[PDB]
């Protein structure tokens, strides 16, 4: 009896930013219009991001109220955290309620709560906050993960799988609430990669309910968690880093990331699927963290995937941008929705087996083998 | 087959601070010798702490180089984190190596790594650093917990239990590496919370190996993880809070913390032990996070524990102070050591069943039911 995803709910801040207008907005609110060459670089980052829009808690008003946030490097952790701590909770609450609704069981049946937040360190944490906000059982078993990064969607599933499978009747609520208020900052001519964060990172929360042995008279499985794995890409040291400083969470991304990830994907696939006697990567449905269009293009090319295999993944990137750990669940959600609309037999675009990838600091790759459920 | 603790290793910074001399040290290195009145309150704080010594990464030299850390509140997070990130990994590595040695298996057999650090946020984190430092399998399945606090000893065991029992052959290395460099700060007349942490918090790391179905020809069980629970103490909102600020980590505890926790213990005991048909709290061996001397006194009093029940717990507090999440493992380690020296029948002071408690922000209480193992 495999751990099974039985519900997915998502939420995003109400402020929508169309990518086509972001360069002008970003350079204006960060008083960087005098940096003509830097603006062209940023403009191109946005144009090549393959992101059409994003939802952000940050607004021009908030930046006016907090100039130290608009600055590339200014003491601002305190003001960022004040907003971050509240934002991840409220956004996570919205997503959790939607997940709980789809799940179909009363929230009192939630036995475990896993919360994952890029930033917003607080003691007690967002897990405690959500327990109070959702009025969950005070004895709900919680796990709180701060600062894991973009591979965390796989991490929370890896955890949920073992919890669900080792505890009869366990019903795990996962909440990945990602807010970039702690990362949002002005551009730097000396650290050109920092602004990549403002070109691709969006806000969003995803909640999922995971449990083994579904009560088919009320619960409705979406995807089964077959196996999970995590690995560190060889010779990838320092390619993706984030430091929590007095100026908030930094963003470091080396130009080698796309090739490092794409060149190692087949190994992750082989390790995960050889045990299942599966070698045709195109026979799987794909849910890959859209760290960037380069990663997706290179993975598609190097793995030998058909052009549209990552269609849903690319669509989510286009509609919401990179929402860190929550992204893969938006993709998972949209995939089962599109599968239904396209009249396909399974939640995985009609295919039986699938793979979910999380990519992040390490470089770390989380590989989750999934099995679809009939539509 | 229950997840089983098969090894425990510990480590502490090389700088030992005797509590009897800390008041003078503290106010001296923080240029607070002029605050005679406040110095008296701190001296009293340390005297009733029941802590004889602590090991800290901070030194007079470090404070002289970083006066912004010595100040009660000054933009100093960057300098703090630089040391914190390095410290937790180095201290964690030492404890891990010791645990691995006791375990008796090649480190290549480690399948999962759980790292827990009060502070030292970094991406990638301490789990990544330790994987590299210990040269563990690149595919080791890692879990990294930052800023959980003092109940985390139970949290990591609760996690390790499910990992080990749901994955045949899984061998989990847990590393709780706690350093207080991020929360060390000078005294302030307009503040009276952060001063308590300066008197009770110590540095230290503990590592343990957890696995189900031990290979008895090489592995040697110490304690079995029977059940785990986590709960939020009723009407305790805001009682224990910690915030990571530009001035580092700051804690604020209501004076009611000891009472809130102690009054809730019997409930945790009942929930965890009624299913095992156990009701005599003195029939269990005890491992309780020594948040402070008050918590130990009130738990003993309200629960009705005989004087020797928290002996090891109190001894660890006396010898190391409050080392956050790592503490319960120092206690677990010392308990089986003393049990052996006392020629007792089990690793749990000759008793069969035991309980490990973690107390922290929430207020959160982690309750782990333990089973000792026979000792020849």
Swiss-Prot record, chain A:
Enzyme active site: 150
Annotated protein name in UniProt: Polyketide synthase BAS
CDD domains cross-referenced by the UniProt entry: CHS_like
Any GO molecular function: acyltransferase activity, transferring groups other than amino-acyl groups
Effect of residue 324 to V: Enhanced benzalacetone synthase activity
Signal peptide span: none
Pathway noted in the entry: Secondary metabolite biosynthesis; flavonoid biosynthesis
The UniProt record lists the keyword Transferase: yes
Gene3D superfamilies: 3.40.47.10
Enzyme Commission code: 2.3.1.212
Similarity comment text for this entry: Belongs to the thiolase-like superfamily. Chalcone/stilbene synthases family.
Organism: Rheum palmatum (Chinese rhubarb)
Keyword vocabulary terms for this entry: Acyltransferase, Chromophore, Hydroxylation, Transferase
Function per UniProt: Polyketide synthase producing 4-hydroxybenzalacetone. Can use p-coumaryl-CoA as substrate but does not accept hexanoyl-CoA, isobutyryl-CoA, isovaleryl-CoA, and acetyl-CoA as a substrates. Catalyzes the initial key reaction step in the biosynthesis of phenylbutanoids.
GO BP of this protein: flavonoid biosynthetic process; polyketide biosynthetic process
PANTHER family: CHALCONE SYNTHASE, HYDROXYMETHYLGLUTARYL-COA SYNTHASE
pH dependence: Optimum pH is 8.0-8.8.
Keyword Transferase: yes
Residues found modified as S-(4-hydroxycinnamyl)cysteine: 150
Quaternary data: Homodimer.
Major enzyme class: transferase
Catalyzed reaction equations: 4-coumaroyl-CoA + malonyl-CoA + H2O + H(+) = 4-hydroxybenzalacetone + 2 CO2 + 2 CoA
Superkingdom in the source lineage: Eukaryota
Classification of source organism: Eukaryota, Viridiplantae, Streptophyta, Embryophyta, Tracheophyta
């Amino acid at each position: 009896k495999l751990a099974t995803v039985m519900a997915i709910g998502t939420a995003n801040p109400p402020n929508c930013y169309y990518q086509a207008d972001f360069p002008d907005f970003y350079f204006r609110v960060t008083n960087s219009d005098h940096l003509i060459n830097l603006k062209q670089k940023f403009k191109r980052l946005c144009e090549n991001s393959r992101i059409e829009k994003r939802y952000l808690h940050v607004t021009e008003e908030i930046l006016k109220e907090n100039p130290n946030i608009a600055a590339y490097e200014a003491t601002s952790l305190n003001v960022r955290h004040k907003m971050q701590v509240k934002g991840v909770a409220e956004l996570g609450k919205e997503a959790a309620l939607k997940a709980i609704k789809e799940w179909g069981q009363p929230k009192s049946k939630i036995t475990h709560l896993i919360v994952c937040c890029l930033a917003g360190v607080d003691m007690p944490g967002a897990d405690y906050q959500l327990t109070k906000l959702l009025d969950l059982d005070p004895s709900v078993k919680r796990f709180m993960f701060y600062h894991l990064g973009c591979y965390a969607g796989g991490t929370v599933l890896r955890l949920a799988k073992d919890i669900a499978e080792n505890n009869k009747g366990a019903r795990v609520l996962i909440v990945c609430s990602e807010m970039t208020t702690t990362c949002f900052r002005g551009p730097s001519e000396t650290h050109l990669d920092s602004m990549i964060g403002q070109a691709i990172l969006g806000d969003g929360a995803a909640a999922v309910i995971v449990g083994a042995d579904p009560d088919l008279t009320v619960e409705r499985p979406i995807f089964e968690l077959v196996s999970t794995a995590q690995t560190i890409v060889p010779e990838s040291h320092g390619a993706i880093e984030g430091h929590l400083l007095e100026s908030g969470l930094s963003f470091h991304l080396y130009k080698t990331v796309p090739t490092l990830i794409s060149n190692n994907i087949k190994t992750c696939l082989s390790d995960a699927f050889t045990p299942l006697n599966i070698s045709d990567w195109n026979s799987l449905f794909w849910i890959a963290h859209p760290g960037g269009p380069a990663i997706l293009d290179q993975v598609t090319a190097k793995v030998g995937l058909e052009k549209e295999k990552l269609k849903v993944t690319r669509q989510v990137l286009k509609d919401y941008g990179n929402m860190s750990s929550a992204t893969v669940f938006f993709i998972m959600d949209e995939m089962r929705k599109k599968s239904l609309e396209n009249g396909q037999a399974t939640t995985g675009e009609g295919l039986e087996w699938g793979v979910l990838f999380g990519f992040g600091p390490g470089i770390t790759v989380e590989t989750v083998v999934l099995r679809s459920v009939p539509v």
